[PDB]
Amino acid sequence: SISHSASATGNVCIEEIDVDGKFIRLKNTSEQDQPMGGWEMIRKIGDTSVSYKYTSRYVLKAGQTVTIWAANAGVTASPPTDLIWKNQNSWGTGEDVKVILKNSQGEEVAQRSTVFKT
Amino acid sequence: SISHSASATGNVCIEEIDVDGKFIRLKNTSEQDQPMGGWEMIRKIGDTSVSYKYTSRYVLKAGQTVTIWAANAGVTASPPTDLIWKNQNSWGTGEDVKVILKNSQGEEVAQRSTVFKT
């Protein structure tokens, strides 16, 4: 049934898209701090594609994660380890989700999918 | 530079191939505990395809990671969290790796890559 796919071209990799639809977690695989200012994260469930734009001064430090929770998730924001998506609630479950991460230029530096079949 | 790849058709997925060359970590993303008896990890470096056959009754519980430590790594076994690979030592650095998980039937349930390009 469940099927996962992933890719990366650098330090940051998308680690998990929650099956219950409450968070998206990224991680810095490298040992070098990655400035993520101006980066973008586009989550596409079918037709809709919602984009989270990182703050101008964000730095995902080495070997550490960032968990973008939804507003309805019930988890408060404690940056930098945890952040909250502004004005976007849970995306839901059962639908194919694909999350694309884009740098400041606009290239795709990472991806992750969760295609459901039956 | 460094690239990444991943695939999964079930609960168990491969989470990291050590760049230094000391461990291969998996995880049971789903809530279902997975019976992992007789499964095999074919770590394909270049031509060689060394493989680790699992115990008869090992089970990866929900949201639980297993790390197949090398012999020369220096970490003692502490099952079920960590396990050791018999007489395999280090993969090395700068080597393109591919670790393929195999179920008891012989099918592939996971995949990971770490293609290094200067």
Residue B58 one-letter amino acid: Y
Q: How far, in Å, CA of B18 to CA of B21, rounded?
A: 5
Helices marked H in A1-118: none
Asked if A88 reaches chain B (Cβ–Cβ under 8 Å), the answer is: no
- Per-window interface: A 13-72 vs B, CB < 8 A: 13, 16, 19, 29-30
Q: How far, in Å, CA of B76 to CA of B69, rounded?
A: 9
Site from A1, A2, A14 to mutate, B interface, most B CB atoms within 10 angstroms: A2
User: To what resolution in angstroms was this structure determined?
Assistant: 3.6
The β-bridge relationship of strands A2-8 and B4-8 is antiparallel
Quick check: B6 and B13 in contact, CB under 8 A?
yes
Whether B4 and A6 lie within 8 Å, measured CB to CB: yes
Q: How far, in Å, CA of A81 to CA of A48, rounded?
A: 27
Asked if B11 reaches chain A (Cβ–Cβ under 8 Å), the answer is: yes
Cα angle A78-A79-A85, degrees, rounded to a multiple of 5: 85
Interface size A-B, in CB pairs within 8 Å, comes to 38
- Among the partner-chain residues A2, A3, A7, the one whose CB lies closest to the CB of B5 is A7
Q: A39 CA to chain B: closest CA distance, Å? A: 19
The phi and psi torsions of A71 (rounded to 5 degrees) equal -65, -35
Q: A56 CA to chain B: closest CA distance, Å? A: 25
Q: How far, in Å, CA of B9 to CA of B102, rounded?
A: 11
A80 preceded by a cis bond (ω within 30 of 0): yes
Number of other CB atoms surrounding residue A110 within 10 Å: 24
- Among the partner-chain residues B1, B3, B7, the one whose CB lies closest to the CB of A4 is B7
Quick check: B53 and B68 in contact, CB under 8 A?
no
Quick check: B40 and B51 in contact, CB under 8 A?
yes
The β-bridge relationship of strands B82-84 and B65-69 is parallel
Asked if A3 reaches chain B (Cβ–Cβ under 8 Å), the answer is: yes
Distances A94 to A86, A114, B77 between C-alpha atoms, Å: 23, 10, 38
Closest CA to B65 of B48, B44, B79: B79
